[PDB]
Paper text:
In the present study, we report a PET hydrolase from Cryptosporangium aurantiacum (CaPETase) that exhibits remarkable PET degradation activity at ambient temperatures and high thermostability. CaPETase shows an α/β hydrolase fold and a nine-stranded β-sheet at the center surrounded by six α-helices and two 310-helices.
Interestingly, CaPETase exhibits a somewhat different backbone structure at the active site compared with other PET hydrolases. Interestingly, CaPETase also showed significant differences in the backbone torsion angles at the five connecting loops (β3–α1, β4–α2, β6–β7, β7–α4, and β8–α5) that form an active site, whereas comparisons of the corresponding loops between the other three PET hydrolases exhibited less differences, suggesting that CaPETase has a unique active site conformation. Near the β3–α1 loop, distinct residues positioned in the β4–α2 loop and a W105–L108–G124 network force, which form a unique side-chain internal network, appear to influence the conformation of the β3–α1 loop. A unique A192–G212–F248 network is formed under the β8–α5 loop, where catalytic H246 is located. Finally, an R176–W200–F209 network appears to trigger conformational differences in the α3-helix and β6–β7 loop. In addition to the unique backbone conformation at the active site, residues forming the substrate binding cleft of CaPETase showed significant differences compared with other thermophilic PET hydrolases.
Residue numbers in the entry: 43 to 299
Write the structure that this text describes.
Amino acid sequence: DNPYQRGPDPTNASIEAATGPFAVGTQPIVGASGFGGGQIYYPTDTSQTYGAVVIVPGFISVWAQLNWLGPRLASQGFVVIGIETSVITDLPDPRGDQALAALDWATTRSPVASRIDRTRLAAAGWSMGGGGLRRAALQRPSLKAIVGMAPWNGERNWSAVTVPTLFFGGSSDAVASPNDHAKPFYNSITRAEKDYIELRNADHFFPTSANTTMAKYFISWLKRWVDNDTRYTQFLCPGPSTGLFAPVSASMNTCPF
């Protein structure tokens, strides 16, 4: 059996729910080094450990703009480390260094170190925080997954990445348009499993409000890679519809992974 599987067998309804089956606790990040602080979210059930995901903010912004993700993901059986950057205008690569510094803090020094399986980690981010996932994955190829939401990075060559990569784009995003950011990054990745999902009519701020389409695939990606949980492949492969009225306007992946 897979010792990392958490929660009952999933359904479309279970990945779309605002809250998964785990009760959630939260507390601020206090005495962090190498990043700006933030908030941690975690299952209160200490009968088992969980993987952890660090989430990095993005468009001249703070963690609060993404904070719906804390309970949304932690309640599916993850430790979520939502961070502030050292400077709100930090470039992408520093944000990736800070993502790794916050994983290191969480697993070694934080009050919930004992709740995390330090061998099963992921990084995620919005906008320039999503652009920082290249540096996080290249510096830490042991990450199980990266998830970029409207990622922004002038560097389009992510060919050295070997970490399973999910990107979300927005069809109405003029800040980090798919054509100039997420799709070039996705197209350069030849050495990792990958998935690209574009949200119809969505602008650069789609990650800042509860979005069931983004959440259900984010959850599924973390389950599949952080937990090795192949019960979630069914939602990723073939993945979303792209018809004229669907909430997804474009979908590409390396199914069956």
